[PDB]
Amino acid sequence: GVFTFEDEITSTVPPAKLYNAMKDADSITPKIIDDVKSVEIVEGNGGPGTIKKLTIVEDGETKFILHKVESIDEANYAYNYSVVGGVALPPTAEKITFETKLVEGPNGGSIGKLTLKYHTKGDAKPDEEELKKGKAKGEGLFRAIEGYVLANPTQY
């Protein structure tokens, strides 16, 4: 089955800058977020089909999160990717897709729009707990790229 969720988050940063900063996420994230040790490209060029391995330390234990880039649309500040393995993929989930768009806010900031597609194995249903966890970690990630841009004005 497929379960869909919609969320929005706001920022002071204009979408073009934020979107450029999001392209640099691989280097930004381990700097800002303590639990993130590294982001490695396993397969691909950054574009669609690229398979990334995130290395996380939680409760002193090293764990891996696997991301697959689904599509990119630079003109529309749009970026689609999937959790396709590791600790962030619950056992009854095939994959969890994050569809991302930034649009200009009122006041020349951004509104980041998220569409979340939770793909279950057959009859299975998504875990409320894991959703809470994914949503908190996702929002923090957005904040890490934002905090970064805000803290380094000249770079974007």
Ligand SMILES: O=c1c(O)c(-c2ccc(O)c(O)c2)oc2cc(O)cc(O)c12
């Ligand atoms: O740091 C992170 C983290 O701990 C988890 C996570 C999620 C569900 C679990 O059940 C769990 O044990 C860990 O996901 C993440 C997902 C990201 O995209 C980025 C992160 O930095 C984390």
